[PDB]
Amino acid sequence: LDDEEKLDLFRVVAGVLHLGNIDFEEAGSTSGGCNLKNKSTQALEYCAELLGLDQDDLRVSLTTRVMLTTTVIKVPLKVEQANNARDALAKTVYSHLFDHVVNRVNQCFPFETSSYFIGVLDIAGFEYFEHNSFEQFCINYCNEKLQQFFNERILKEEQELYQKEGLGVNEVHYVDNQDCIDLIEARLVGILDILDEENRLPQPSDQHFTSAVHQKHKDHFRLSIPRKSKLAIHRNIRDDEGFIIRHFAGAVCYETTQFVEKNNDALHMSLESLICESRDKFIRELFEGKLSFISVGNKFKTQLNLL
Amino acid sequence: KPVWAPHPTDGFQVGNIVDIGPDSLTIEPLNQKGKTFLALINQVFPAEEDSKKDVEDNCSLMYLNEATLLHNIKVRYSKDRIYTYVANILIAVNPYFDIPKIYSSETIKSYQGKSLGTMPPHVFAIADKAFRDMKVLKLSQSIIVSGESGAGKTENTKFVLRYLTESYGTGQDIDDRIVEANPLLEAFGNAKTVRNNNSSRFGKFVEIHFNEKSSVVGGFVSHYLLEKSRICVQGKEERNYHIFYRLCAGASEDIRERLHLSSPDNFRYLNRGCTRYFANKETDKQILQNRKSPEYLKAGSLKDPLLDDHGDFIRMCTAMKKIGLDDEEKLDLFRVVAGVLHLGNIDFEEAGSTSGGCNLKNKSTQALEYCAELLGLDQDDLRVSLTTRVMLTTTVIKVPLKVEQANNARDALAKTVYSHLFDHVVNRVNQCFPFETSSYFIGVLDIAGFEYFEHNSFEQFCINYCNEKLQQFFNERILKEEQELYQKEGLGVNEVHYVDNQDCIDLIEARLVGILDILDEENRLPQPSDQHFTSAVHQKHKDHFRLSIPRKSKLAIHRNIRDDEGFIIRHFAGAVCYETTQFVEKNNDALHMSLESLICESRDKFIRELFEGKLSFISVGNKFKTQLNLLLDKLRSTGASFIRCIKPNLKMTSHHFEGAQILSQLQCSGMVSVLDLMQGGFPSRASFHELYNMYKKYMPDKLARLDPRLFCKALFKALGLNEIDYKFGLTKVFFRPGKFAEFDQIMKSDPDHLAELVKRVNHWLICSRWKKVQ
Amino acid sequence: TTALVCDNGSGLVKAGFAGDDAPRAVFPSIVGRPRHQGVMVGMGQKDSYVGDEAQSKRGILTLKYPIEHGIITNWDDMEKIWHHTFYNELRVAPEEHPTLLTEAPLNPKANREKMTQIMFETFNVPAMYVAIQAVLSLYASGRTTGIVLDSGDGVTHNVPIYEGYALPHAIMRLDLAGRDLTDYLMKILTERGYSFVTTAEREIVRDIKEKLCYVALDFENEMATAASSSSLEKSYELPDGQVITIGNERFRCPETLFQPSFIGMESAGIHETTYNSIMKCDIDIRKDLYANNVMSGGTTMYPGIADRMQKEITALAPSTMKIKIIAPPERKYSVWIGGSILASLSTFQQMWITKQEYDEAGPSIVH
Question: Which residues does this entry mark as bearing Methionine (R)-sulfoxide (chain C)?
Fold first, then answer.
């Protein structure tokens, strides 16, 4: 990696830091519209210098919903959707930046004609804390799918081997965790199928999402309410503040604060025709009408089932 | 009993029936348990008891259907027996590699004069049968080779012509001219289609003449159907003709600078479709840099096992000196082909003094100087001939044309020159094998079968219309004539009527109300429209069962097509939607009288040699209907022979059998339909030699020394089978329904009783020794 | 598979599949039979041309909008609207899509029944829902509270909604806008000698209603500045080459929304229907009806609204109360962007009427 290219890597990381310093407000002529704060003018001049974009064309791209009638109009966004768009634009740049670093490294050991291969996975195990959120639910959900893999590769395949070596051994059935899979990722009725539908709803709510888990799955043995838990900590948590999923590794309570915000990864089309259209050669190299919000939890479910 | 189950990948797979009810046939696969699906009555077909058998004749099967016919071809593909007799139709499978000794001259000398069924099916067993009918009924025989393009219809045609000029003698001083000439005329007529890279867009008809002494007197090759529209407009994945890519990638720099030729993207007739060359790795570096277009630089060469554009230009110029074409005349042939390319670069506009008139563009002045130099005409006299309508009052006035009629006149003048150029090349070749006093003759047709694509236009409607007329010929020569033969051999058989396709003929070509009778009337109308032509089909034929609208179709693709964008004609080979875009433009072939008094009046001697008040627009669709019905009169007047060539895979490689595409070639060739009418009163009918091989294994060695004519007449007399259920013919045994399956269980039952009945009929043959001798 | 959002505009029928970008088909609803004799005889001419082809064939037809004052003229022309839309615009079979239809908040029975019933028996959709256009404009605006002003040709509406309930006794339907604004514009353009009297030529009037109209800040003071020699006069060009100069009448026509006395109808302006609907709502809720005043429809795209509407409401409304009038760009497609969000949401798939249950139930329960 050249030192002149390392300085452009530092300009992209610093541009994410001065993206977060942009603060919105309401106005308008539109009357409903979204504008920026007075303190965000000096921060927008230093942010557009690192990104390589014009300031006026970035200010009406963070605050509007571009659409066409083919003319191509612009429709100002709400303030909460502006704060979610700035945060989604910051997560979008770091996504393509992480894939660019591994592509620079993979280029230092290229491969030619292959057939056999030895893979080496390195992913964490059931890590549970005192306060658990969305990312701890994605780690424990990935551990429940890997443990169902271990139950059909360590227990099912092994007893196929006892019947291949002449030992015979009568089959012993294992307790399946498939019921947790058809709770977290079940189609239409799953937790990620209600979390991604909440973000599509106008005026999303954390109290509405918490009551929708208990309203949709009233009877499931893997699911419990905070008042049904015996642990003390959980005794301080209120009914609309979290829910308990029983896992193979234990029963873990997940708080519902900012769950919906964390499931927002909306890639606005006007910001796509801006980050692609950058004047900087490094950003161009980095990035080298459906579906509205796109989905975050089902973006990760696609990359988990592909692995 | 196991049946054949529809499988997506294999087409048909083995499986039993384990639950039954209306539209609820639960099929468990064989040896693949678990995958138990459901079917419909029309998708399930019964299977043969023995899986190791393979029969030369498919009327020797017990349960005859499409799945038992596709299994007999799959087993004989595995055992390398590509030539297979299905009734009176030869089915040939292309192996795409050379099989040992089947094309040997010892094989050809063996087959000579042998009777059918006595020797195994071969390409030369059809040509030997249609030589003894020259001495029996004394009628000229037409070999008709069918099958999808790239199926071997031209290579198997060269095998048939080599047998006729060898087995029955010589005839010609030089054989090899007939064989060698075919790739020469395929340089001019082959193109690239979505289905096949090397495809012929013309229907050649070889006419090998003979005499009353039964010796060859020479030949004559013609051609029917030429895709004239291809010159002007090409599809995205299609090329134009393969001579233009052999002239811009082949010819030298002291030929290209003399003809003022540039890269294909500069010429209007070559910049619409694909401009890429067919080349291999070694040839890619041999092609000059100035000949490579930006699209060739970006997307590279096209790959094929056989074709190479620069390679085929060397074998084109070698084949030119082998038909006696002079190099000075080859340069005038290159001036005519290059003159069509710089004709398309002429662009019109409006003006005038006439005020309504048509003029040319500023960019068309340099192109008109190079076009008139190749054609041999004056520039001023060609500019007021492309833009005016000359008429007389006898003075002779000139009336300027419209701009759309100028663009149609330039395109019609380009198609007119290539028409007379294609007839000039076959006249140069026919002159290398002239004929003298003839009487009998053996014709060989080579025309493509039902080729349907995802996007179908006018030329795909002319191919499917020609296939519906040829299939109505096959329904009155394979089904009508054959059941006349069952009543000539004493078999009798009650007549079974076939489903006619005459209703499609009186839809496409019906007088006054037909589709071509509305398409040719649209071009005569002032301001033609594609929306007016599409609504006129549904307005004129509102109720016809063969016609459907895009919204009435169930296929998805057709769901994207709008009502005024196309119409669906149901054919015997399937339902094909034809888009109406540029249909009217393709039906325009107007030959303006001022251009006729210009191309005839050329100052060049070669053009004069090429071309050696009614009706306005003349007609294109009825020009081709005239030449199609004239070829039908040559088929109804001659004795026909039916060869069908099946492509086993799209890769075009040996030992690969897809099973789904091959099934579609049995369904898009009438094979299933001919093998359902023919079943009639005697579904199984097997020859004496076939019944000797299938049942000798149940007989001891000593008893198996008998000849098959005596073994089949002693086994029929020993069993004492009833003649009304088991009819004994001259060379075959004809079995009534359910009695070949009952005869197979006779032979697979009591060996001691069957050997005792053979002993009894042997005793009768000792007594009937002298009775026959007088 | 995919659901289809088809908005029964009175303009301006709008059609497009479920999300995520803009409608696929928009057209001016006109059906027109040919009023002159053909002489060229061709033939091939259609019995009735729909839009857009009937806007390329002006002067040879007699244009008839099929929905007039929210009432469908006959379902013979309506079915041809539908058939044209699905087949020759969208290119889709109704058996492939559950559909979404729209209606007005207050419309006579059995106009939604007869519609729903005919569309189920003629086009045989597998499931259907009929939404009022105002509720969909709240989904589009992203608010769950407020009074919705949905103003299109030829029916405007005033619906108050509060999180997330509706108050039946406060919903107001005005038949004031917009075809009567077109007819009034045609009546005050005759006043300047521009004889646009014919049915077809009324579309040209509609184009001058779109582009050249503007609104005053205060009527009395704009009338003052009209007396001055200043250029309120704007020159439009007509398809036959004529140049039309309108000035005073240019701001006069939209002002009708604040003064229906100009047209001569007894009803009171949007100003007063806003106040009188708010003061039919309960005391506590009035606080949040103010500042969630949401405009919608194509006829609210006149330039001086909403800040005319703002200043006028602020004069009648209680003192020291904050008033904001929410008016985004794109209001003509507001309803459609609503519908797109609605039919895409789970679980409201099960608030669609399905064909099997409809077969038993018929027009009952729909309403």
Answer: 40, 43
Q: H-type helices in B54-212, by residue range?
A: 66-78, 105-111, 124-127, 129-136, 155-164, 176-189
Instruction: Name the active-site residue from B154, B157, B523, B587.
Output: B154
Question: Residue B25 and residue B38: Cα distance in Å, rounded?
Answer: 5
Residue B94 annotated as binding site? yes
Q: Tell me the β-bridge partners of C50.
A: C31
The answer to whether B251 and B341 are in contact (CB under 8 A) is no
DSSP letter string, C339-353 = HHHHHHSSSGGGGSE
Which residue in C213, C223, C158, C219 sits closest to C181, CA to CA? Answer: C213
Task: Determine the residue type at B458.
Answer: F
Whether B449 is a known active-site residue: answer yes
Six-digit token string for B517: 């009778």
What phi-psi label fits residue B14: left (phi over 0), alpha (psi between -120 and 50 degrees) or beta?
beta
The DSSP annotation for C49-66 comes to EETTGGGSSTTSEEEE-S
- Spell out which residues of chain A touch residue C333, defining contact as CB-CB under 8 Å: 69
Distance CA B255, CA B248 (A): 10
Nearest CA among B687, B692, B685 for reference residue B734: B685
For residue A206, give the H/E element and its range.
helix A206-216
Cα–Cα distance measured from residue A307 to residue A268, given in angstroms and rounded to the nearest whole number: 28
C-alpha angle B196-B201-B202 in degrees, rounded to nearest 5: 140
Nearest in space to A269 (alpha carbons), one of A85, A121, A33: A85
Please state, in angstroms and rounded to a whole number, the distance separating the CA atoms of residues B521 and B622.
Answer: 11
- For residue C183, the SS3 value is helix
- Please give the order of strands across the beta sheet that includes B726-728: B684-687, B732-735, B726-728
Q: Which of B14, B107, B116, B123 is nearest to B57 (CA)?
A: B116
* β-pairing verdict for C243-246 and A223-224: unpaired
Residues 6+ apart with CB under 8 A from C170: C160, C277, C278, C280, C281
Residue identified by tokens 């340089």 is: B187
Across C133-277, the runs of DSSP E, i.e. the strands, are 145-152, 155-162, 165-166, 172-174, 234-237, 243-246
Q: Tokens representing B363? A: 């960019």
Q: How far apart (Å, rounded) are the C-alpha atoms in residues C341 and A257?
A: 25
**CA B467/CA B469 separation, integer angstroms:** 5
Q: Going edge to edge, which strands form the sheet with B3-7?
A: B37-39, B25-29, B11-19, B3-7, B45-46
Show Cβ contacts of residue B739 under 8 Å, excluding neighbours closer than 6 positions.
B684, B725, B726
Cβ within 8 Å, pair B559-C87: no
List residues of chain A with CB under 8 Å from any CB of chain C: 30-33, 67-69, 73-76, 78, 81, 188, 193, 197, 200-203, 289-292
Q: Is B518 helix (H, G, I), strand (E, B) or coil?
A: helix
Residue B442 has φ and ψ, to the nearest 5°, of -120, 110
Number of CB atoms found within 10 A of residue B285's CB: 7
In chain B, after which residues does the backbone break, taking C–N over 2.5 angstroms as a break? 394, 612
Give the method of determination.
cryo-EM
Question: A29, A65, A73, A75: best mutation site toward chain C, by most C Cβ within 10 Å?
Answer: A75
Query: Nearest Cα to A296, choosing from A257, A256, A261, A244?
Result: A261
Resolution (Å units): 5.5
Question: Residue A187 CA to chain centroid, in angstroms?
Answer: 18
Tell me how crowded residue B567 is: count the other CB atoms within 10 A of its CB: 22
Q: Do B532 and C44 touch (CB under 8 A)?
A: yes
Residue B611 contacts residue B420 (beta carbons within 8 Å): yes
CB burial of B181-197 (b: ≥16 within 10 Å; e: otherwise) equals: bbebbbbbbbbbbeebb
- What is the DSSP secondary structure assignment for residue B10, as one 8-state letter? T
